[PDB]
Design a binder for this molecule. Structure first.
Ligand SMILES: Cc1cc2nc3c(=O)[nH]c(=O)nc-3n(C[C@H](O)[C@H](O)[C@H](O)COP(=O)(O)OP(=O)(O)OC[C@H]3O[C@@H](n4cnc5c(N)ncnc54)[C@H](O)[C@@H]3O)c2cc1C
Ligand SMILES: Cc1cc2nc3c(=O)[nH]c(=O)nc-3n(C[C@H](O)[C@H](O)[C@H](O)COP(=O)(O)OP(=O)(O)OC[C@H]3O[C@@H](n4cnc5c(N)ncnc54)[C@H](O)[C@@H]3O)c2cc1C
Ligand SMILES: NC(=O)c1ccc[n+]([C@@H]2O[C@H](COP(=O)([O-])OP(=O)(O)OC[C@H]3O[C@@H](n4cnc5c(N)ncnc54)[C@H](OP(=O)(O)O)[C@@H]3O)[C@@H](O)[C@H]2O)c1
Ligand SMILES: NC(=O)c1ccc[n+]([C@@H]2O[C@H](COP(=O)([O-])OP(=O)(O)OC[C@H]3O[C@@H](n4cnc5c(N)ncnc54)[C@H](OP(=O)(O)O)[C@@H]3O)[C@@H](O)[C@H]2O)c1
Lengths: 446, 447
């Protein structure tokens, strides 16, 4: 109805938030651009759409989801609630604070099922190339539609990139991998923990993947777990059959050797070494290059590409906050696309981003980090009609979560926190984490 | 010479393409400028083994489907280069079914001698090829992973040598989303010892199934089941390996089959083939076909009929391999160089149709490899590729077929005669089943 045409790449949480932002503005009576969203999977959800598939999907594209069986929320759900679609509204009842994948998946779909935005999406279509033409001032987006096996392009006035940054593995090599006889994989290819039942598992890395894949491995009966770190130990007090050591240095037919001179028989090695920002459809003029951090550079307000401000990136930061961060972002992007918030000059954009980067470098403690992100989110929601929830109250919730993890890393998921949107407190779940062997939504909600 | 060629990939076909040009210039011709792009850090293609699975370190798809303990699948006598013999490379006779590392060494040998490595830009992935109608040139856009830059270059011709056995065809079966063992495609199979003392289901009834089964067996898998969609492999298997009708569904631990059987299974390996997948090509340049002896739209099986400045090498199914690619690369070379002019689109189409009509006739393995030999024969008669004896190579194939029928676990223990040198291969020092060391070093010593 407005003259322009927008392309949204990806229908993960960020892609869905972006459609939702437009749908919301129009429901309040605005005229909005034409929307096309492209998604390579057959259904929306992004990471949350679980697949048994590993490696390359059935059309030959990279498998996107890194999620595995038995995965549950990693932080209080109370911290990732939508300000415009509460947990109360979706579920009709109170539920525990750390829901399984399927439940959280259900929740986010619910919002966009209600919004009726599914119709903007062309599923099973992979983005191949985006180019900007200087003379028309438009982007040409080329895609492959895998349902018809045709490749075609279309012209757009703005492009919002919502393709995530936790799907292309960073996989470093260690000496002797070419002759190790057990399995080597990246966290990205981890599926069923029962595959590692009665086995000795090495996890390389000291971040969330290593904490969590370790825990699932443990909880489903891995015989022994070794996890090893490059910089500093995770530092949690692990179960009896799990130990932390200095980094792996080499491997041979059955054995792993470590930097402290230890050595051990190992059955499988899981690289929990993170991901890279990888945009294979973008040229150097549009393509973001960064490591995982709270403040990537060259994004104004963390979302506008400074070299071509008709291009936007959603959710490319590291994530303490997640779902409502993407909303705050998508709402911003929407508003600038729609002319409601004009942009400053390239010089001020750069100055502003530099200030944000300066402060990022200041940050030492987990507490400072999520607060920094809250400060960021706060800035965004103040500029748009996103409902402004209570950021400091969400920070306390993060703080409590931090503590519970320290107390006992195996039972942090058994606690409860209060919604910052509704005020409702979460009930205890009906089963302790360690004993809830059934990841299904059906079991979680009975 | 005025023009500029882009060669995509430095596997056996890419290397053959470089070698054809180098050869022509060694006999005194002026050749085009050459750029070859390879995404891996070394040449060899499938033969360059990687422990990596899924996506490689730059984020590109892992290319090699090869696994530890792999050896040649047919007589080496059948895949010898007519211009670089096994005798010349190795300085001695060797057995007929060499390991991966040994064949790898042999093909690199030819191009190390030719000095063509300097044309290649390694660690560079091809992203897009476009043809511009107004300049009549191709713009090839690539990412260099050493510098992390994306750039383009203009070319007059493009030869595509990126292979067709690297993007898995992976079908879904009911209940995969809840099975608790591993699911993988043959593409991701690396060490057989990962399946020691385990029960392994192999879905499929072709070469991957035969060979991944055999490796699994030979390295001590407890039990093997292999199931087929159309017809059984039909070989007489070991005692802990059986063939059944197709898998229908799966649950937490169990596999159920079409004949009503059911079994506890540890790992499922899909041995279901690959797809021709060219993610850098638009519909005007992109070949779409299933695995076969005669894909359609390739004139002489190499020239893209819709834009004859674009060429495809090694896109057929492979009885013959390495010297088929040479026959082709030499043909492509000669057309690109002006030595062989092309007919009209109409005759290209008519000729291709005739070849396809015959491909539909083929029933027996013997007819199939003979067809391919007829095809190869046609190509080498048009270029100065040395014409070896195709009928003699056909016999070798035929003997190989027999040995496989007699005993599927000892076909690799036989020996055949080179069709290039006449030399007969010696017996290997170790029976296949007992040769647990896949290394070049072990294969070439005398114990
Ligand atoms: C293993 C794991 C566990 C996590 N757990 C939690 C958690 O418990 N809590 C939490 O808050 N966050 C968690 N996260 C963070 C997660 O990043 C966010 O929750 C959320 O998934 C961000 O979604 P997104 O839309 O930005 O990207 P994604 O969820 O990755 O989705 C991006 C979309 O882009 C599509 N796409 C990509 N490339 C193309 C292409 N070339 N063409 C077409 N479409 C394309 C993908 O198919 C996908 O649908 C987890 C992440 C991982 C990897
Ligand atoms: C598991 C397996 C076992 C086999 N065993 C035998 C055997 O024993 N005997 C036999 O005769 N044949 C065998 N083959 C057949 C095999 O196809 C040929 O031997 C030979 O490897 C074909 O070489 P190629 O150059 O055509 O393709 P490939 O060997 O696949 O090489 C193609 C090259 O293209 C490069 N490439 C692809 N995409 C890009 C890109 N986008 N950008 C840059 N570079 C790219 C690749 O990295 C690779 O180097 C086997 C095949 C498989 C899968
Ligand atoms: C989800 O997922 C996100 C992170 O997922 P993630 O846990 O997979 O990755 P991540 O949070 O970005 O961390 C990657 C991890 O891999 C470790 N690492 C990287 N290279 C290594 C190497 N060569 N050897 C050993 N360890 C290495 C890093 O160790 P160091 O940084 O300490 O060296 C870090 O612990 C979280 O933000 C959450 O929101
Ligand atoms: C190398 O590698 C090449 C082939 O390698 P390859 O063995 O992996 O692939 P292939 O030779 O192309 O054969 C693919 C195999 O997968 C089987 N298959 C496909 N879909 C299936 C399904 N849904 N269920 C069960 N079986 C299925 C086919 O069975 P069917 O064709 O009989 O149905 C066939 O046996 C050889 O030519 C050699 O040169």
């Amino acid at each position: 109805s407005m003259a322009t045409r927008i392309a949204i790449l990806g229908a993960g949480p960020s892609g869905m938030a972006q459609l939702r932002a437009f749908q919301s503005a129009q429901e309040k009576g605005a005229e909005i651009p034409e929307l096309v969203c492209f998604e390579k999977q057959a259904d929306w959800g992004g990471q949350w759409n679980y697949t048994w598939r590993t490696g390359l999907d059935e059309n030959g594209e990279p498998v996107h989801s890194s999620m595995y069986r038995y995965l549950w929320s990693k932080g209080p759900k109370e911290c990732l609630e939508f300000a415009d679609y509460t947990f109360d509204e979706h579920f009709g009842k109170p539920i525990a604070s750390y829901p399984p994948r399927e439940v959280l998946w259900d929740y986010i779909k619910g919002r966009v099922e209600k919004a009726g935005v599914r119709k903007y999406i062309r599923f099973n279509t992979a983005v191949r190339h985006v180019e900007f033409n200087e003379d028309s001032q438009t982007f040409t987006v080329t895609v492959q539609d895998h349902t018809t096996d045709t490749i075609y392009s279309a012209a757009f006035d703005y492009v919002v990139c919502c393709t995530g940054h936790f799907s292309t593995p960073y996989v470093p090599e260690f000496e002797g991998f070419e002759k190790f006889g057990g399995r080597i994989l990246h966290a990205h290819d981890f599926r069923d923990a029962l595959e590692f039942k009665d086995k000795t598992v090495l996890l390389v890395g000291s971040s969330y993947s290593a904490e969590d894949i370790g825990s699932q491995c443990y909880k489903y009966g891995a015989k022994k777990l070794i996890s090893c770190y490059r910089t500093a130990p995770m530092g949690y007090k692990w179960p009896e059959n799990w130990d932390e050591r200095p980094n792996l240095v080499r491997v041979d037919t059955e054995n792993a050797y470590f930097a402290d001179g230890s050595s051990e028989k190992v059955d499988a090695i899981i690289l929990c070494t993170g991901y890279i920002h990888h945009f294979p459809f973008l040229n150097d003029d549009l393509r973001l290059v960064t490591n995982n951090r709270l403040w990537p550079l060259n994004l104004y307000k963390g979302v506008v590409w400074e070299d071509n401000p008709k291009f936007f990136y959603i959710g490319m930061q590291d994530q303490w906050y997640s779902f409502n961060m993407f909303d705050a972002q998508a709402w911003y992007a929407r508003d600038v696309i729609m002319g409601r918030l004009p942009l400053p000059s390239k010089e001020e954009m750069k100055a502003d981003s530099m200030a944000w980067r300066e402060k990022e470098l200041t940050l030492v403690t987990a507490e400072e980090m999520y607060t920094y992100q809250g400060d960021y989110i706060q800035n965004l929601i103040d500029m748009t009609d996103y409902p402004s929830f209570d950021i400091p109250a969400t920070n306390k919730t993060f703080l409590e979560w931090k503590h519970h993890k320290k107390e006992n890393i195996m039972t942090f998921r058994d606690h409860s926190y209060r919604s910052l949107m509704t005020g409702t407190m979460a009930p205890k779940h009906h089963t302790p984490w360690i004993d809830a062997l059934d990841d299904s939504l059906e079991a979680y909600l009975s």
